[PDB]
Amino acid sequence: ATTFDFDSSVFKKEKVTLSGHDEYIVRGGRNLFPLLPDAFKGIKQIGVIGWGSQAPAQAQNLKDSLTEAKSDVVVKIGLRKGSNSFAEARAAGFSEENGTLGDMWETISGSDLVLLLISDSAQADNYEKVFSHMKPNSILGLSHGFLLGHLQSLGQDFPKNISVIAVCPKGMGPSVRRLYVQGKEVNGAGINSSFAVHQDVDGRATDVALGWSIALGSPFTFATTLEQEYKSDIFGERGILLGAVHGIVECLFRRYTESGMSEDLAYKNTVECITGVISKTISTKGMLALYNSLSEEGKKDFQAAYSASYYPSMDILYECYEDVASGSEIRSVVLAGRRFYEKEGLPAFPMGKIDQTRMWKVGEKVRSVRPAGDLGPLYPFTAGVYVALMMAQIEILRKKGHSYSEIINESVIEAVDSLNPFMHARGVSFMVDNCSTTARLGSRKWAPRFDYILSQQALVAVDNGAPINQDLISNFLSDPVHEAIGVCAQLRPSVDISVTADADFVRPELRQA
Amino acid sequence: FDFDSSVFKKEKVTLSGHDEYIVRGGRNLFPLLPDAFKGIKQIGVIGWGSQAPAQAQNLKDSLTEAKSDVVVKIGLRKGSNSFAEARAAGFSEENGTLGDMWETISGSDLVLLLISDSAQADNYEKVFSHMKPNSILGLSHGFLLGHLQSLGQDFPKNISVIAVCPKGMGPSVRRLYVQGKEVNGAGINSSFAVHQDVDGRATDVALGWSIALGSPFTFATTLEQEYKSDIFGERGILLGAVHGIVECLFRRYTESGMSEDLAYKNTVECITGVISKTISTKGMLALYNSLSEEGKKDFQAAYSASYYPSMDILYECYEDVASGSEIRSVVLAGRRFYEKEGLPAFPMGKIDQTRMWKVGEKVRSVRPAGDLGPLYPFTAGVYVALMMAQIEILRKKGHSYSEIINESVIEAVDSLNPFMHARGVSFMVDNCSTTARLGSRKWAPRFDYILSQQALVAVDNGAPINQDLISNFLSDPVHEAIGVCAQLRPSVDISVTADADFVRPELRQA
Ligand SMILES: NC(=O)C1=CN([C@@H]2O[C@H](COP(=O)(O)OP(=O)(O)OC[C@H]3O[C@@H](n4cnc5c(N)ncnc54)[C@H](OP(=O)(O)O)[C@@H]3O)[C@@H](O)[C@H]2O)C=CC1
Ligand SMILES: CC(C)N(O)C(=O)C(=O)O
Ligand SMILES: CC(C)N(O)C(=O)C(=O)O
Ligand SMILES: [Cl-]
Ligand SMILES: [Cl-]
C-alpha cells in the first residue's frame, strides 16, 4: 500500500528502515555493469523514442554502460518525421551510419524494449499508434506514470500482450547525464530513480526495470506504482522543486527591496541563499543541522517566517495535489500541448521566457562578478519560508499515503542534488526549462499561486505581529522525516554535480557562452 | 435557443449582422406576472449568500406591485446564521416566509437553488428528492449541468429545469432595482435557458422571474453555453484579469519611479472610474479617440504588447472550463474548507491587505466626491487589449454577441468596477460567488505573471507596434454591436459607497 517489495534474480535487494518503515532498495555502481546482459535477456534492441531532456541523457548513459558491460544490445534513437533533433542525436554518437538513428515508428517496430521519452501530452494523443507498432510480447518502458492517468480518464488501458514498466529519475535530464560522467572517475554516480511494474507478460519485467535504472547510474532505486508516481511527481514539480521555490524567491525579493534592501543583497538573500548554503547543508547534513547553524537571534527570525508560511503553503500544495489526483491537471497539460499549434482559427501559443524580468536581470549582474566557490549567505527569514514549504509538502504527501523514499526524493534530495545547482549557475530558466514540458507548464501555472498566497497571508501575518505558532516549530524539530533523510544520505555517492552557466550538456536552446 | 412567449413581447436586435431575440424589461410589465407564473403559489428561495438576498427582495417587491398572492419563502439549513439576516430583510417564520431548507423545497412550485455551486454538486440528490412532480427547478448558473455531465448524469425526468442568470453581482441586482423604482425600472441584464419543460409553462416562468428581478433586457442561452462563458469570464476580464493587470501595472509604475499614490490612481482609479464610464456609455473606440496623439501612441504600445499574452491565458482558462477540469477543481476546493483526512480546514483568506491595497485606503480617504480618477493611456491600452482578446476567444469558441458583450464588457463597467472604485478589490471580488472568488484567486496571478514576463518585457525591448492588430481593433464589428446594446441601457448609474448596507454581511462597514 505505501511500500512495495519486489524480487530480483540478478541484483541484490537490501532493506532500509525509514522512521520504522522497512523499504527495499537496490544500490547502484559501475561494478554492477557486468550484470546487464543477464538483466536484459531477450533484448536485442532498445528503442529510445524522443530527444528532449531525458532521452539525450538516458541514451548516452545506457550506451556507455552497455559498452562497459561488453554487451551486444543496440541502442537506437527514433524521432518523428518533423523533428529537428537528428543533428543533436548524431553529435551525441547515434547515427544512420551504425543503424542507431531513424524514424520513430520504424524504431518502435524493431525494438524489444521501447523507452517512450516524448512529451506527456504527445503520449496522450498518440498512444494508439505506439501500441499498434509494438512487437507482441515486447516491453514498453515509461519514465513517468502520466500515460496511466490519461488512460484512466478515458476508461482505457494498455494492450494485453505487452509488459509495461517504468524507471523514473528523480532529477533533471542534464543532471542524470552530468553526474554519470563525473562518476566515471569513481564507482559511478547519478540520480536516484523509482521503478514500477504495471504489467508483466513473461517474468522479465522486474530485472529489465532494475537493469535500466542501474545502467542510468541511479545511486539507489526504490519501488513505486505508476499511479503513486504520477500523483507525487506532477505535484512535486509544481511544489517545492520548481513552482513553489520560484514563487518564494519572487515574493521575498519584492518584499526585501520594498523594505530598503539593495537589489544585489535581496538577490543574494533569496536565490543565492537557497541554492547555495541551504541546499549544501540539507544535501549532506539535513534540515536540523541547518536550523542549528543559525544564531540565537537568527532562530527567532526563522521561527517567525516558518510559523507564518507553513499553513498558507500547505493550502496551495493541498489544492495542487487534489487537482493531480482527480484528473483535472493531467487533462490541462494534454489540452495545453494542443495549443502549441494553430487550431480553431486561433494562434499557436508556445511557452515563453520566464527570466527576463527585474530580479533575473539583477541575477545576471550579481553572477557577472561572483567569485567561483561562493556559497551565499544563510539569511534566517528566507530559510524559514523555504523549510516551512518543504515540511508542508512532506506532510501533504504523508497524509495522502506515499512511502518515505518517494517523499524524500520528491521533496528534499531532488531539489538539493539535482535542481538548485542549475539555478545557482544561471537563474530560474536554466533550472525550470531543462525539465519536461509537463514540469515547465506546471511551474508557470503554480509559481504565481505561491507568490500571491505568501504575500497576502504569510507576510501580512508577520507585519501585523501575529504570534509565533511554537507548536509548528516543535513539530519541525521532532519530525521523523529528519532521521529518514539521514538514512537516505548514506546512499549518496561522494560526487556533487558540477554545472556552470556555459554548460553544453543542457537543452540546445539553453546553451550560452 | 429559439423561444416563444405567450405572455411577453419578443423583439429582434441585430448585432454585427446577427439577429438575436430579446425580451425588454420594465416595471410596466409587472401586471403580467400573475399570467407568467401559471401554477405557482410559492417560490422557495434556497440560500442567503449574494444572489438570494437580492433576488428574494426584488421578487417580493415586484409581486407586491403586481398585487400577486404568490408567496416568497426563504429556505435555510439547520442552525444557519442567515436566519437573522433574512428576518432583517422582512422574511419570517411567523408569516411563513422563512423556514427549513428541505421543507421549503418540498412545498415550492418554483425552487431557486441559490447556494454555493460546490454545495449544489455535493447535495443535488437530496434537492431532487424533495421536488414535487411537475414543479420547476430554477438555477442562476449552469455549473450543476457541467458537474452532472462529468458523472454521466442528468436532471430528474418529472421536473422542469430553467435558468435566469444575472450578468452582475448580487448587491448590484438589488441596488439598481431599488434605484429604478421611480423611473420605470433599472437592473442587471440576464440570460435565460430552458433545459427541461414538462408542460409548456417553463418559458414564461423564466421570463417572468427575469423581468421581476429588474433585468433591462433578457437574452436566450443554454445551460452549457452559460457555464462555459460564465466560469471563464469571472476568471477573465471581470475579476481575475483586472486584478492581475492592476497588480502588475502598480509594480511597474512604482519601479519606474511613480509615487504610490499616483501608481494606484493610474491603475485602479483610472480603470474603475473614467475608463469604465467611457466604455459604459460611449464605447472603447470613443475611449481611444479621446486620447491625444501621444496618448494614442502609448495606448498602441500597450495594446500591441498585451493582446497575445492576455489571449494565451484566456484560451487556457476557457478550455479548462469546457473540459470539466475547472468545475471539478471548484467542487474539491469546497470540501477543503473543512477538516478531512487528518488535514486542516482552509477557508478563503483576505486578498486586500497587501501593499497596493493599503495605499488604496489612503487614496480613498482624501478622494473628493465625484472624482473619477486620471486617464492614463498605457493603462487603457493594457485593459482594452485584454477586453478585446476575451471577445475574440468567445467569438472563436462559438458564443452569441449578446452573451459575449455582457460577459466581457457590460458587467465589468456597470456592475463590478463601481465596487472596486468604492472600496478596493475585496469589495468587488468577495461580493461575488464562492465559484467566482476561488476563480479570481486562481487566475489573477496568471495574468500578472504573463504580462510582466512577456508584454512588459516586449515594451522594454522596443517591440514594433503590430499595425494589423491596431487596424483590426479600430474596425472591429463588436464596437457597433456594443452601441446597439447600450441603447437598451437605462439612464441610471449604480450608487455605491464604502458604507453600503446592501453588500454581504461580512463586508459591511462603518
Ligand atoms: N525532463 C526531465 O528531467 C524529466 C522528465 N521525465 C519524463 O520523461 C519523459 C520525456 O520527457 P522530456 O525528456 O522532458 O521531454 P519533453 O517533455 O521535453 O518532450 C520533448 C520531446 O518530445 C517530442 N515530441 C513532442 N511531440 C511529439 C509528437 N507528436 N510525436 C513524437 N514526439 C514528440 C519532441 O520531439 P522532437 O525532438 O522531434 O522535437 C522531443 O523529443 C516524460 O514522460 C517526462 O514526464 C522524467 C523525469 C524527469
Ligand atoms: C523537476 C523535474 C526534473 N522533474 O523531476 C520532473 O518530473 C519533470 O521534468 O517532469
Ligand atoms: C463576477 C460575478 C458577479 N459573476 O457574474 C459571477 O458569475 C459569479 O459571482 O459567479
Ligand atoms: Cl556527454
Ligand atoms: Cl437593500
Ligand SMILES: [Mg+2]
Ligand atoms: Mg519528477
Ligand SMILES: [Mg+2]
Ligand atoms: Mg514530472
Ligand SMILES: [Mg+2]
Ligand atoms: Mg457571471
Ligand SMILES: [Mg+2]
Ligand atoms: Mg459565476
